[PDB]
Structures are given as C-alpha cells and as structure tokens.
Amino acid sequence: GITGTWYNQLGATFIVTAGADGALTGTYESNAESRYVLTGRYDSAPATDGSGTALGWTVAWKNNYRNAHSATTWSGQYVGGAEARINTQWLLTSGTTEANAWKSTLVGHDTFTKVKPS
Amino acid sequence: EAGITGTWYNQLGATFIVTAGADGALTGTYESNAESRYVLTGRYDSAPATDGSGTALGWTVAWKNNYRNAHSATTWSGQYVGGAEARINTQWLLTSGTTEANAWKSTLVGHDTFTKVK
Amino acid sequence: GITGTWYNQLGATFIVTAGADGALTGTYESAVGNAESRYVLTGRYDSAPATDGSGTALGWTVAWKNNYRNAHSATTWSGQYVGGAEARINTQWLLTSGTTEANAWKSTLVGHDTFTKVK
Amino acid sequence: GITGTWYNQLGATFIVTAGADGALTGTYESAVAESRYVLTGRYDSAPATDGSGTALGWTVAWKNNYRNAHSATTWSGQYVGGAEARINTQWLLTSGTTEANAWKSTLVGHDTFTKVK
C-alpha cells in the first residue's frame, strides 16, 4: 500500500502514512536539518478494473533551520505490484513578487519506490 | 496575520473553505449541496519573506466523498498575494487512476484563481 | 482565424501564420519591441476542426537563442483557438533550460498564457 | 547529435533533422502508415560546452489524411549527448473543446527518447 518509506530518483526520503479517512501525513527529507512536514489526500476506494490509486500531497519548505519560501505539490497515482511505485508529476511554487510570478513555478516528475538510489 | 483563513471562490463557481494554522497547516473543504463537498488539506509558509513576495502554499483534494467517487485527485500549487484584492493564484494537476495502458492520459493540468468575493 | 498578431497578458507579441494543412510559422518578442528580444517560432494546428462548437487545437515552440543572446533554453505553448465573441488563444506552457544532470530537476518552468488580438 | 531517429517506450518513432538554423522538422509515427503525422519545432543551435544539455521543443497536430483527433501535443526538453544520448521531455496535449469543457482540455506528461530502437 501507500503507507511507508519511499525514495525518489534523487535520494529524497518520503515518509508517509495513509489514513483510513483519506489523509496523507508525514515527513519529507531532501538529517533533521533537511527534514520537512507534509500532508495530502488519496482515494481510499479505488476502482477495481486494474486502475491505480489517485493521490496528492504538499511540502512547504520551511522548518526550524531554514526557509526557502516555496512549496511543492505532488499529484499522481500509486501502482501496486511486484515493484510498487508512486508516479507523480509535481509543481514547486516559490513566493515571488508579481513581477517574478511568471517564473514562480517549476514542474517535474518524481518516481518513488522503496529502494534508495546509490 | 497570514490572511489565508476563510472562504475563497474560483472562476467556475467552486468554493474553497480553509483555515491556516500556526504550525503551517491548511485544512478545510472544497465544494460546488452535500453531494458536491470534499475534504482538503495542505501547507503554507508561515514565515514569508518581508521583501514583497507572496506566500507559498499548496493543497490536495481527492474526489471521493460519501456520495460518489471519481477515482481522481487534484493538487493546487501556488501562492497567496495579500492586499485589497487578495487572491490565491494556482496551477493544478488532476490525476485519475488509470491502467498503465492509459497512464499517458491520466493527468490533466490547468490553473485556478481564487478570490474572497464571487 | 488563427493567422494574425496576438498578445499575451504580459504583453509579449506573437505573429503567426497558419498554412494550408496545418503549419504554424512566425516570430515571438517582448513588448519593448527591440530586435535583441525577437525569436523564431514554429508549430502546428488542426486544419479541419469539428463542426459542433469545439475550438481548434494547436501548439508552438521558441528556442531562446537569436543573433544577440543565448539563454540556453526553450518554451513550448499548447492550446486551442476559439472563434467568435472575440477570438482567443488559451495556452499552457513549458520552459526548459539546459542543465547538468545534477540540476535537471530544476530545468523546467510551467505556466499559462492567454492571447487575444488586442493588447 | 540531435539529427536522426528517436524512439520512446510506447512504440512511437520519430525522424528529425536538426537544421543549422535551429529548426526541427520531421515525422512522428504514433504506431509501428495511417499513423504518421508532421512534427516541427526548435532547438538551441549553440549550446554550452560545460556539461549542460541542449534545450529544445516540438509540436504535433493529430490530423493527417486519414484521421483527425482534433488535438495537438507539444514536447519541451533537452538533448543530452554522449555514448548514451537522450532527449528528456515534458509534454502538453490540448484537444479542441467547447468552453464548457475547457477545464478538461489539456493533459500533461513526460517522455524520454533514445537513439537505440
């Protein structure tokens, strides 16, 4: 299932818990210095025709050591299987002035698995 | 104060009801009637820069409630811009649960803007 | 309907021609209008849209190199033209910058632009 | 290093020429003959020589003489050279829609192409 410790293709660590009511809660680490709170939602009653499980979550990149004045949201689906994975697309929006709002948002794609790259 | 807590309306008649807590959290509901209401959660920067920049945030809605399930989730990533005409400018990703064969068509992308009045 | 001069919300200027079975050509520049700010674009559109009231799908690219400047990057816009009532072109875009592999995660910006034949 | 034939993992093939002027022109076959479409776009014809990749983008409108999906895809990305050359992209697919359905007009995704079939 979704609950557990996941790693993306860059070594970041996604420690998540999926609650019964549809919640996602946890920590995202890019040690404690580099660790941040997360929260999100997931479809707690997915289709039964082979489709994956829809979900999303948010990290604001502030903690007690640093603040980058930004937030990433990941939107994706869990795909169960021999090598379970969470395939996401993400949007990183930074706090900008109006003048710089056109370049406020980065987009990318993260694949999470249970194994950490070397 | 952060200025985010309250009711927000988008360009299509949707209604976003949120509370911004002291620990950086966003919680609330997103709706159109009970059949159209859904839970949300997210994060925001509680210590934004003081150089005129907006306030980074993000939130997620999974499209299941007690009355229906679209096997889908939307994440909104963006920033709060205070002032007379406060607004929250976002970009969103809607991922549907799909089979892998159909995964290429799993994610819709768009943008929404929210205001305090309709 | 697509052939013409369009402007986005930030005042960029898009001069485009739609050819017989689907080509888009033209140029893209800044509202300042200096030549150092002008770039080539190319793209495609649907030359036989539906007859049910739906818009016309299209897209194009600009690489941000010209004779004066090189940002080592490129934007693509994807959208639809919808006619009558004041023609509009509603788009989403992607800007990719050349990066080392180590920085590829930060290579791409996303946004949206709406163009009208009015400034 | 861009000119030639590129493949994805979905059975798509495209043949492109990277012109000395920055143009990209070619054909995109969505299914390995009634499935071929024109492609055109642009790329950075003087990239850096510091390890960075080469920026590029292209479009395909899904109409040909035999069929028409009333839609178009744009890919934005970069070429990475070397023994193991790649084109790494993000893409957007927009369909023609009525305004009532415009909220659902655009799909987003990513695709990587290689020189090895």
Side-chain angles (χ1 to χ4, degrees):
Chain A
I2 294 161
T3 298
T5 292
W6 303 77
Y7 305 93
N8 64 12
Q9 72 295 336
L10 292 170
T13 307
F14 167 45
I15 304 164
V16 74
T17 301
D21 55 348
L24 295 177
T25 65
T27 110
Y28 202 98
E29 193 180 311
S30 61
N31 57 59
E33 302 197 57
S34 302
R35 196 170 308 152
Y36 306 84
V37 176
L38 73 99
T39 207
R41 305 285 297 163
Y42 77 104
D43 172 6
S44 61
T48 61
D49 56 359
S51 303
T53 300
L55 89 172
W57 68 96
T58 304
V59 174
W61 298 102
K62 169 201 172 248
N63 66 24
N64 305 139
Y65 302 78
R66 36 177 63 89
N67 187 351
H69 302 313
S70 61
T72 288
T73 62
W74 297 256
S75 179
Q77 59 183 126
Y78 161 89
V79 181
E83 161 226 77
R85 86 180 9 215
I86 306 175
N87 297 323
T88 67
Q89 296 254 207
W90 59 254
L91 301 170
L92 168 54
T93 303
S94 297
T96 71
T97 53
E98 240 151 37
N100 288 332
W102 71 273
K103 56 168 180 190
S104 64
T105 313
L106 280 167
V107 61
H109 50 96
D110 286 353
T111 307
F112 292 88
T113 65
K114 302 285 179 83
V115 181
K116 187 194 232 297
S118 294
Chain B
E1 238 321 319
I4 299 171
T5 298
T7 295
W8 299 83
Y9 303 96
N10 79 358
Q11 74 275 352
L12 290 172
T15 299
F16 162 62
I17 308 247
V18 76
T19 294
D23 59 349
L26 264 12
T27 53
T29 54
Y30 198 92
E31 58 197 41
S32 90
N33 71 294
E35 286 95 348
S36 91
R37 297 201 218 98
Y38 307 82
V39 171
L40 78 95
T41 184
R43 302 286 299 164
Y44 80 103
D45 183 1
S46 64
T50 41
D51 68 358
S53 291
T55 301
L57 54 71
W59 73 94
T60 300
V61 173
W63 299 102
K64 165 182 188 330
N65 62 22
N66 291 331
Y67 313 95
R68 59 224 293 208
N69 194 343
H71 305 310
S72 293
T74 282
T75 58
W76 291 262
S77 176
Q79 56 183 131
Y80 163 82
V81 189
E85 80 102 88
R87 33 31 252 276
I88 301 163
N89 303 321
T90 71
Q91 303 193 255
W92 59 256
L93 294 170
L94 163 55
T95 304
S96 294
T98 76
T99 56
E100 295 245 71
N102 289 338
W104 67 274
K105 54 171 183 195
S106 66
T107 308
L108 287 166
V109 62
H111 55 91
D112 259 294
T113 300
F114 301 86
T115 62
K116 281 185 166 48
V117 319
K118 252 152 150 182
Chain C
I2 285 163
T3 287
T5 291
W6 297 82
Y7 304 97
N8 73 6
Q9 72 288 342
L10 273 169
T13 299
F14 166 49
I15 310 173
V16 77
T17 301
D21 217 20
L24 298 187
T25 40
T27 66
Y28 203 91
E29 61 188 91
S30 75
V32 186
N34 54 312
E36 294 99 332
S37 85
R38 184 180 305 107
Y39 303 85
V40 166
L41 69 104
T42 170
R44 307 278 304 163
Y45 78 102
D46 177 2
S47 63
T51 44
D52 66 355
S54 296
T56 305
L58 42 54
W60 72 93
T61 305
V62 173
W64 296 108
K65 178 189 147 44
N66 66 12
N67 295 345
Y68 306 96
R69 274 172 211 171
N70 199 350
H72 299 315
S73 59
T75 284
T76 65
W77 297 255
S78 189
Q80 59 183 137
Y81 156 89
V82 359
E86 244 358 315
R88 264 191 165 41
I89 291 170
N90 295 328
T91 73
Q92 297 273 189
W93 57 258
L94 301 165
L95 168 61
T96 303
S97 282
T99 70
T100 65
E101 308 260 48
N103 286 338
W105 69 268
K106 54 170 156 156
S107 70
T108 311
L109 291 165
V110 59
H112 48 104
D113 291 345
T114 184
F115 302 82
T116 45
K117 300 225 244 233
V118 124
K119 256 168 183 169
Chain D
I2 299 170
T3 290
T5 309
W6 295 86
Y7 306 91
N8 73 357
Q9 304 286 143
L10 288 192
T13 297
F14 78 79
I15 184 171
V16 70
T17 296
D21 65 344
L24 297 183
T25 56
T27 298
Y28 197 106
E29 176 181 89
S30 72
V32 193
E34 278 172 45
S35 83
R36 305 166 172 156
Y37 308 81
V38 176
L39 81 89
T40 200
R42 302 287 298 169
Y43 78 103
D44 176 9
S45 56
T49 72
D50 70 344
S52 292
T54 299
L56 87 178
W58 73 91
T59 303
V60 173
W62 305 109
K63 160 173 195 303
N64 66 28
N65 291 134
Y66 319 98
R67 47 204 339 175
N68 185 358
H70 310 306
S71 61
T73 302
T74 70
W75 295 260
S76 183
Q78 40 182 150
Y79 164 83
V80 181
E84 288 194 271
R86 301 272 178 285
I87 298 181
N88 299 316
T89 71
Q90 305 234 230
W91 61 256
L92 298 165
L93 165 54
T94 306
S95 291
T97 78
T98 50
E99 14 276 293
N101 297 335
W103 66 275
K104 60 197 193 158
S105 72
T106 313
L107 292 169
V108 61
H110 48 99
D111 215 2
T112 301
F113 302 86
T114 50
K115 294 194 165 150
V116 192
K117 180 164 156 198

